[PDB]
Amino acid sequence: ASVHGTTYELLRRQGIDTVFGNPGSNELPFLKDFPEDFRYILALQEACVVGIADGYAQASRKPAFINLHSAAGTGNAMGALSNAWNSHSPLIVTAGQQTRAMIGVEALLTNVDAANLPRPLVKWSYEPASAAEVPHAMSRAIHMASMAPQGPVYLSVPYDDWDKDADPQSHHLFDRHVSSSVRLNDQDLDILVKALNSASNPAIVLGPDVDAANANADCVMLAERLKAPVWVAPSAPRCPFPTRHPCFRGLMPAGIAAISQLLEGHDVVLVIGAPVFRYYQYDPGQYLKPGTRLISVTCDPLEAARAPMGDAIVADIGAMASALANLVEESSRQLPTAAPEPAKVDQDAGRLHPETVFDTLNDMAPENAIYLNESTSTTAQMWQRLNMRNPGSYYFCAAGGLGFALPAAIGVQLAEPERQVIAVIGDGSANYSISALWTAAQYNIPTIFVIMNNGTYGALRWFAGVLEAENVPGLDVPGIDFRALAKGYGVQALKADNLEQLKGSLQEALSAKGPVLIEVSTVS
Amino acid sequence: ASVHGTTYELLRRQGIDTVFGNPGSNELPFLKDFPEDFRYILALQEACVVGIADGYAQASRKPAFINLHSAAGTGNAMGALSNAWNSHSPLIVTAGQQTRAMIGVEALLTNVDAANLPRPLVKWSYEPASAAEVPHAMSRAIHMASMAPQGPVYLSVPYDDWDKDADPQSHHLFDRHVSSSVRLNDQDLDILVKALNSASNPAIVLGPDVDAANANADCVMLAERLKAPVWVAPSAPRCPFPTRHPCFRGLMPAGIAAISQLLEGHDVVLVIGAPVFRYYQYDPGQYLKPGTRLISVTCDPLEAARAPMGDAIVADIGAMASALANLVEESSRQLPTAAPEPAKVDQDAGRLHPETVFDTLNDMAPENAIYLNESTSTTAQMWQRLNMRNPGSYYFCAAGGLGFALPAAIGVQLAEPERQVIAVIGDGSANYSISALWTAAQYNIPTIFVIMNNGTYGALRWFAGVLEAENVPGLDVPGIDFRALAKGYGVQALKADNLEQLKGSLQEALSAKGPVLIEVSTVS
Amino acid sequence: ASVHGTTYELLRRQGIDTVFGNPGSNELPFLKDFPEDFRYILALQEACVVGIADGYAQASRKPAFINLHSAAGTGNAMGALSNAWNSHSPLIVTAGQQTRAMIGVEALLTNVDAANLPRPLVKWSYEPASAAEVPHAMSRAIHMASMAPQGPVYLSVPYDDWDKDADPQSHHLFDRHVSSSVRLNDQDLDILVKALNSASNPAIVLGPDVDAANANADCVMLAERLKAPVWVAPSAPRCPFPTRHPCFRGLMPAGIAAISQLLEGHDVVLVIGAPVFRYYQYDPGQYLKPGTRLISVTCDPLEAARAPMGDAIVADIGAMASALANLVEESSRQLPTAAPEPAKVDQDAGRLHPETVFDTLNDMAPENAIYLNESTSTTAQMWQRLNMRNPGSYYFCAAGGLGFALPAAIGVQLAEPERQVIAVIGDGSANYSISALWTAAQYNIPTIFVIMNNGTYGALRWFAGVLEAENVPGLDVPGIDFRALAKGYGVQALKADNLEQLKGSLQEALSAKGPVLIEVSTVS
Ligand SMILES: Cc1ncc(C[n+]2csc(CCOP(=O)(O)OP(=O)(O)O)c2C)c(N)n1
Ligand SMILES: Cc1ncc(C[n+]2csc(CCOP(=O)(O)OP(=O)(O)O)c2C)c(N)n1
Ligand SMILES: Cc1ncc(C[n+]2csc(CCOP(=O)(O)OP(=O)(O)O)c2C)c(N)n1
Ligand SMILES: [Ca+2]
Ligand SMILES: [Ca+2]
Ligand SMILES: [Ca+2]
Ligand SMILES: [Mg+2]
């Protein structure tokens, strides 16, 4: 067998059947004789390729396979890799290298010092020393990406390798099963369980790795047993809890002082599947107030190491959540009372308040809808106004890198064909990966894109106005016609200048047979 | 003085007055109180920011200053940095880091292991150890980018540094003059000159560093004195010679065998300002045929080291070209005869042959026009059909990374307001950095964009059809309306489905007061 | 031909005939059939291997070739590479890698991520993608190390590569000549010369690159013409000037304030072949006092970039020194008056004052002796008491990394068989690379080692006593018998407990036919 044949067999035997890519000449020898059981999803720029694959992996809870062109293609994707790193997305990123005979002279398209290019945003990064090593290297990539803590990996392959003879002993790679589905030993788990049972006023904080593990339901059981309020860790990339469950308390403010104040009076705080903590704004104060002890369960040693406070346990979130939910006592305390519904913001017949948009989306969207957020100034309100009962219902750029939601929403919709995906994206954010729209059109992936148009980088005006920063350039983005951009890439386009039009536009979009973009005129 | 004040003073004292950027919160403390003598050029995505700055630097022959947002913004720009590396573009790339107090906990927007992110695509990459070091670090960045061989550099700055007190001793940085304007010592230069004088059938090969140094005219004198044919080194990022000069022989094929065959019978081949050589296609054979000796003058030690053949001299191209042109004897040999005009390709009343487009552009464009090329399957014909008499008249992605020409054409037009810029870009390539169009609209930079629409990644179909590669996915890009995309970003749009319409569309574009995009229907 | 045969031919054609090494199994396929025209110099530890090669390269003014074993051998040498980096030593460091077939599984002795190991202490670091690329890669290593600014480079080679067929086109590598022997263009050089001619009170500061270039004599002429005092830049790795020449003013203190005070009243300070400046102690103040302008000529862009003050010119030191010395006017000013001889320190019949040792060495050593210094607390006095008339007469660890002088003194003596090498090394420093002694014994390289034994890390007690640092552990090194260590490695050993014995011991050592170690009892 050839390296080509062996590698594709390894991929299919490991459950991979889709290649997200933007092709180049170094990659043609890999893509030729493309297996009929595989499917190729083209995107027009590499940030889009990786964004789509990322959404697909996060929603499918399995690795996604990517193929890019050498250094330039890899480089175009590096902003997208910074989100993937933060979201622990299992992405296998492959890139074509020049033929081995021309690497030395650094012919056009040589990826120089290739393995170093994507660092430090990958778990593993490699170029094999020979053609026959390629299948083995691919095996390593698959498993490195898939093991906890999951993350992106990078493999560079000289284009002449594919046609070379494979090592017959590579067959041992095909069916390898690698598990990191582990939890704390019985003795120490019993100690933890007793600490939770003994807490007088426990609180629970959940991060994105809960949703990634589909540990949501186990966490619901855990919170019900402990009669504990549940928060989502700050800068949340996913939603790990039903947002209308009686225990739910919403998204934590991303500040040190704010969080310690919030946790005051809680004697034991159990954090599951989150860094401790993904703060954003500088908000100096105490990490924890006297009387509060913190215990973190994380799948990532790097998270456990850098927590400024508390104990930590490094284990699989699915395994740990299930064990805890089934071991803890049912507290005799009263179940927390559900949070009241959000207030209705006054809305005239003109431009839309973001709050109005979210309320309307909540009213009209199916109960199993999936939302993506890249409307940076409206996150707090979004979290308060969308009832998300099911797992996998929310995604937000994990590293804060814009250009995620638009392509990721396409990958999510591909992963979940029966759940309507609705991406709420600011007019600023929409441009970063605008060309992703074409993929939705071409493959008829029926994502709905809601563009919140207020003509400015709103979150920046806020961050600025705060530090009283004056005379800051580059904050306004006037003069973009999103209906025209949608037409450019073959996506049906609608406009909503008021509530009447927003409702009508959503009705049409929800009925449509393909992707739809709605440009919403929002208040400045 | 503050670090902010000191740094801006250093920048202006070193000739920098423009910031190309896409802002983020880590950068607001740098951008606040933006100096009134500076101007900020916003682009909507970082590949575009860097592309624009790159075109500006290459055309202006001076460093360009860039400001990006942390890791995600830097990462979005890394494909653009791969071109900049290959073109020796003096780019000072700065990126905002989280406040020092929050770096440890890895708060949202922390650029982790920041200096390693852009490697290996930068000459120098650094984050200062303290606020007061920032001006010094900026000084280093300016000079590292500017010294031969020029290239991109990276500086990460924690956002809290800007408001801190500067070291008063930083004033010594302001007026530092650093020179690498050097040439071979007299003794060895005399030896080289004698070798050139003694050659019976010399040839000259010129690369992009000739145009960067504005050594074009000196090279013309050198070729006239030596009565030598002149080629452009393969995969040319710039044009280093008047394309209708009697000595000009055009663009060399990017193959080992092709080049040695081309140089056969030439006893001395002098290469100036090029790698030896930027081959592309695998084309095995002899590096040089018996009887041919090669001498390379390059500004880059890395180029000199990796040449598989010939002698090399590492020096400034401007200094070396001037010295050689003024020292060599006037050969009594006959001046080479100019190349004949290209053939006129048969053209019906339907879709345009690329050859027709280039002929028409040559007929109608001003004699001092500047062209950019990202129409990958038509490069050979473009080089044959455009009369480029002046320096700085051609740019092509130096690392072959698409997404360069569209934004770079905007930067070039900004650098050269009196020379009409015309970017010829394929329908595939146009998408990578499509959002750059907005910058042209917003700042009224009157670049003309000619989109060659054939609905496919044509160069890939060629590279494939060659290696008889069958069943390759992802090669077609149907369903893009470029007039709509232009409208989306506020750029006047025209369509040309035939020659009559192409002429009319060019007449209108050349008369227009702002940027114009022409979608040309080209043959499949 | 094989890769083995081709590589050795390349080495000999490029002037390499010696391999400094400590062998391992990955290297046996390279070392087998060792060419009879080559010679192998074994050392017992890798810090010693590299130290010896470093001294050899610095003294010979040509590249030295090193062969180490995989990661562990390379790693053992990394302290030595840190000195080599700072001294711009042209070292070609090769290391054996596992066979390509076993790299993937990471068999014992696999050098993982090999190219990254020696960073950031090398100019270039690489592992070839195939066997046939090895000769080309070696070519690159040779030239990267040899081009200005010179420095160490690293090449990792899988052991199975050597027996493979070489590319016949590799013959083009054999005779490549690469030059960086460049100087400032005529126009700007004339401007510099006029500035020097116009100076009312010029000063000259010289660094190690002067001695490396053998520009010493040209600098003498330059100083005589300008009638200028001459200093050696701080933390000097070499001696660039005759220390008894009337213009000589000695070693500059390694402090910011001290240097600006020293240069006060000098209107133009010309620095040649030094960083600006290699300060050590924190000594805050003005970089330069008002009235002083600085101009630096350096072979290293990294030096030019980081200078906190002055103008800079990046060029070859030999070419620049020669040009300046021959272009400047003869000033009518009076030649500086020679520095008075150092005072004679009172010396009783007991333990030796370091000053006594240096005075005695100066009295007894031949006029063409070469000294190495790793007696860290006595450097200032050494510089004042040794008359060094000739180039290549002094070496001191360029990065301050101990373990340099002992092995380097062996390499220097190998390079200069007719000049007596005398290494003055502290009792602390002597241990770092003690096993190097064996190489001197085995090859009968007649270096004299003078061990200054005061039983303590004297320089550290000083640096401590200064910052009033109390209760510092680990500063004393009692209980070492250096005569026994010398006997252990087969080197003749003598002891000097007083002046009478020091004179007798030196008389014997200077007459000896092989290496000699003298343990001198110095004052605590
Ligand atoms: C790749 C990248 N570039 C820049 C930024 C900085 N940034 C953060 S929020 C923001 C504004 C986004 O504006 P929009 O999408 O319109 O939403 P709004 O803030 O108006 O709600 C910017 C530019 C970023 N996070 N990522
Ligand atoms: C960032 C990047 N992605 C992918 C490629 C691979 N590539 C090279 S040419 C090409 C096709 C370009 O098509 P178009 O711009 O329409 O020009 P045509 O080839 O049709 O003339 C592609 C995808 C690249 N060079 N850079
Ligand atoms: C590899 C290395 N380790 C440690 C040091 C720190 N150091 C600098 S001077 C010194 C003392 C050297 O003592 P000795 O050689 O006896 O000379 P003395 O200071 O007594 O004159 C030490 C340990 C260093 N420079 N390099
Ligand atoms: Ca907005
Ligand atoms: Ca095309
Ligand atoms: Ca001592
Ligand atoms: Mg157990």
Ligand SMILES: [Mg+2]
């Ligand atoms: Mg599915």
Ligand SMILES: [Mg+2]
């Ligand atoms: Mg990197």
Ligand SMILES: [Mg+2]
């Ligand atoms: Mg000269």
Ligand SMILES: [Mg+2]
């Ligand atoms: Mg201009």
Ligand SMILES: [Mg+2]
């Ligand atoms: Mg000159």
Ligand SMILES: [Mg+2]
């Ligand atoms: Mg010698």
